[PDB]
Design a protein around this nucleic acid. Structure first.
Lengths: 23, 83, 153, 62, 141, 136
RNA sequence: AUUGGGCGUAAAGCAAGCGCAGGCGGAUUGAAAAGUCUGGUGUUAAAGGCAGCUGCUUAACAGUUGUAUGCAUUGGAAACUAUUAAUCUAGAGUGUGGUAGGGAGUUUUGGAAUUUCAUGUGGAGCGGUGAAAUGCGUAGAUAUAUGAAGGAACACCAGUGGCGAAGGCGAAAACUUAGGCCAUUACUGACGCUUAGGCUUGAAAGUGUGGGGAGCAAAUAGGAUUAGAUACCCUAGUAGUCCACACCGUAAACGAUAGAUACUAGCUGUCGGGGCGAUCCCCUCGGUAGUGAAGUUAACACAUUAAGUAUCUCGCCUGG
């Protein structure tokens, strides 16, 4: 279990997302 | 299974022990005597020979580490009884 | 880019009836501004192989970023067991390397770079290894921005 | 740009936008294809009947 | 927050951590756990302050005397790892010692080096400011 | 690569293998020392000068000289140029040079310090070939 | 190949274990400050490699000036390294319960085979390769049946199977012994890796000894194709074989892969247990074939049953 929670930063949506609006 | 409950419960190094250096080496030497008697009765048993060498050398390195590890927790079984 | 014949491979095999003699031509092109490429072409007819090589040469145009006009961090390329190691050099010793190595480095827009060729001399495999080494150069912008503490170092 | 599905034995990150949807199920590909089609058909001033409408299908594969 | 099969005592914490990090980079793993080690706590903290590391948390079982430490190897939400590679200079069998005069840049100066000099771990670049040398443990970038 | 067992017996670098040992040794009278004097030119005795058939794929009449040198050895030597060395147990002169079509052949006879018949039909090279100039 | 390579197919893992030395040796604090670093000091031969300078017609040279490791001396930091008292138990096993397996040293029988010998029969053949012959049979051979017997080893049992230091393990039975596997919220306080040295066994062939030889059997004798048939074909046939002592020490002993530590997607299944649960399906941990993404690679292909990644040691290869 965790007792010391430092550096709040997590990785849950590790699936790629890229290539926005393209003409 | 020669001895499993004799020496590790009748002898308490620290406050309480279920597995330790000296209880293990005492049980190991009891099985060593048993296996030496067995191989004297039956000379062609080599698996016991290799197991005995492993057991005695593991006991030797047990004692070697326990030299520095604890001040004095090994002066009960550092010897051998086979002569 | 320039459609220049570089390497001629004399390859051959046999079948049940007739022998297939092919000539894979290897051509390397570049503009020295970053757009560089290489290509091998296989065909029974030499003119057809040359046409295939030309097609690959003018279609494989890929740009390599000009970092500082030379190499600043060591890179080793190994693609096909032909080691090509790079070591930054003073800007006055000139382009000291193999003839093909000097040619490709000069055509890539860089010079004055220490090179180490390990293995045996074979053109296409060494070219693949050099390409693999070229595709290993780093950039500091992403490694700087993506940090929680935004800084290059 | 390429749009692809990912069903049982591949990474969902082999394309630009991620869609883990499936069409092997008989009742899936119907509404999947209808909703994909009516998401672009509006551009050409053409009928759009599965974008926010209650229209839906429950049919086996045929 | 252990992954599975809690890690026993390896030959050295840094080697086990390196295996964990390489496996995280290879087999699509994000959060990895290691045996309790004060130097591990220090290096995780300094990597966090460096910006290449995500959350790190010390962990305890039913008891508090034993400990471990888990940490998320910093991954952006587009499947890229912040750490791309590691190297150890000092080794258990050969702790190479490099004084202040022996602190060069990291392969161009772009990378980060770490030294166990006097107390805790200090970056070679900041160790050169305090004219501090020591045994250099690892190169990372 | 296991340095744990390679410390006792380390790995030695060769970096080259050569076939010219004669230029590596010399001997002196009244005191035996074999000290390497990096001898630019060696001198010995061409006991046998003959012709042997080359390796199996080749059949020619390349010529050689069986020359004994200062160190205990009986080795071969190529004859460079026309006007072959046939001095037959006179003090001749050898230098480093390898021709690999004939077994044993690892040296070249040099004329001008211990001049033999004076290499004819060769004025392109005068490094191991003795030939007077046509110039002035 | 410390710097600067691999060991499966390249030069490449010991035959296999135990395996002392050996190096490594998870983390806390008191202590040394031991190594490390920091702070303190004196030393580092000229010309000189290097370097500002001059005199060389100018360079060839000469000088001027300086460029320091190294070595002896003294205190602080506490990270890692050996660590102290205590240690933390997550390992090594070990208290304990369940626990499966061709594991094995030891000792027993049973099945029958096999060929014979007492027993009688009976008429005419047996041997065999591509075809035959060598070689056997009326004075009774084939074949025969029970009685009795010698050495000899046990059709099947034999698996997405298990146990295995390697070599291996199956007619059974048991003494003993070993290794486990699952689980123990647990203990010595990490008490362990490789292995110089030492110890051990080692498939099988074969050897001296004593005995046995049932059976086949090289070498071959004879015979069949043959140009030769010496290798391959058939019969007669002994060394050999076989039981134990002593000697055997190698195998294509391999996983073409020495290990130990720690970690890493999965899946069809299945095996041992903890098992709810007719069995089940279903799993928890270890194992058992494959799988394919990362990873790996000269390619073969391997991939959580790595040829994957890192830590420590013994064996080896530098072109043939």
């Amino acid at each position: 279990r965790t007792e010391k929670a430092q550096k709040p930063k997590e990785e849950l949506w590790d699936v790629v997302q890229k290539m926005g609006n393209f003409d | 299974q020669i001895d499993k409950n004799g020496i590790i419960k009748s002898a308490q190094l620290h406050d309480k022990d279920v597995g330790s250096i000296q209880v293990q080496v005492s049980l190991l030497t009891s099985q060593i005597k048993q296996l030496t008697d067995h191989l004297l009765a039956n000379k062609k048993d080599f698996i016991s020979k290799r197991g005995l060498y492993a057991k005695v050398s593991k006991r030797k390195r047990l004692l070697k580490y326990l030299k520095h590890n604890d001040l004095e927790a090994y002066r009960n079984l550092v010897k051998t009884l086979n002569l | 880019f320039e459609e220049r014949i570089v390497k001629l491979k004399r390859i051959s095999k046999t079948t049940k009836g007739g022998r297939n003699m092919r000539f894979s031509v290897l051509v390397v092109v570049g503009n020295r501004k970053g757009k560089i490429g290489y290509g091998i072409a296989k065909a029974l007819e030499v003119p057809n192989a040359i046409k295939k090589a030309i097609k690959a040469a003018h279609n494989s145009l890929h740009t390599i970023e000009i970092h500082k006009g030379s190499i600043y961090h060591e890179v080793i390329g190994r693609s096909g067991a032909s080691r090509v190691l790079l070591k930054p050099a003073p800007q006055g010793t000139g382009i000291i390397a193999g003839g093909a190595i000097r040619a490709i480095i000069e055509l890539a827009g860089y010079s004055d770079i220490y090179t180490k060729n390990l293995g045996r001399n074979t053109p296409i495999n060494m070219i693949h290894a050099t390409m693999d080494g070229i595709l290993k150069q780093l950039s500091p912008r992403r490694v700087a921005i993506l940090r929680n503490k935004n800084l290059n170092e | 740009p390429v749009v692809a599905l990912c069903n049982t034995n591949t990474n969902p990150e082999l394309v630009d936008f991620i869609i883990p949807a499936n069409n092997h199920q008989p009742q899936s590909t119907c509404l999947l294809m209808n909703l994909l089609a009516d998401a672009v058909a509006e551009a050409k001033a053409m009928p759009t009947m599965f974008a926010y409408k209650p229209d839906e299908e429950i049919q086996i594969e045929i | 927050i252990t992954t599975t099969k809690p890690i026993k005592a390896h030959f050295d914490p840094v080697a086990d951590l390196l295996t964990k990090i390489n496996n995280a980079r290879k087999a699509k793993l994000m959060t990895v756990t290691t045996i309790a080690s004060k130097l591990k706590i220090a290096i995780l903290e300094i990597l966090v302050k460096e910006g290449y590391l995500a959350n790190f948390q010390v962990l305890e079982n039913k008891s508090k005397t034993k400990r471990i430490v888990t940490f998320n190897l910093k991954y952006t939400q587009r499947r890229i790892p912040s750490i791309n590679g590691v190297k150890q200079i000092s080794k258990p069998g050969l702790r190479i010692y490099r004084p202040f005069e022996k602190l060069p840049l990291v392969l161009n100066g772009l990378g980060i080096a770490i030294i166990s000099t006097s107390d805790g771990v200090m970056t070679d670049k900041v160790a050169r400011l305090k004219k501090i040398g020591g045994e250099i443990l690892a190169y990372v970038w | 690569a296991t340095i744990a067992q390679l410390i006792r017996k380390p790995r030695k670098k060769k970096k080259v293998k050569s076939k010219s040992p004669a230029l590596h040794y010399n001997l002196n009278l009244l005191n035996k020392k074999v000290t390497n004097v990096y001898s630019p030119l060696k001198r010995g005795v061409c006991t046998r000068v003959g012709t042997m058939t080359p390796k199996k794929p080749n059949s020619a009449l390349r010529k050689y000289a069986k020359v004994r040198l200062t160190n205990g050895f009986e080795v071969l030597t190529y004859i460079p140029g026309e006007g072959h060395n046939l001095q037959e147990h006179s003090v001749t002169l050898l230098r480093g040079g390898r021709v690999k079509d004939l077994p044993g052949v690892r040296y070249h006879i040099v004329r001008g310090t211990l001049d033999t018949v004076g290499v004819e039909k060769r004025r392109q090279q005068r490094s191991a070939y003795g030939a007077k100039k046509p110039k002035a």
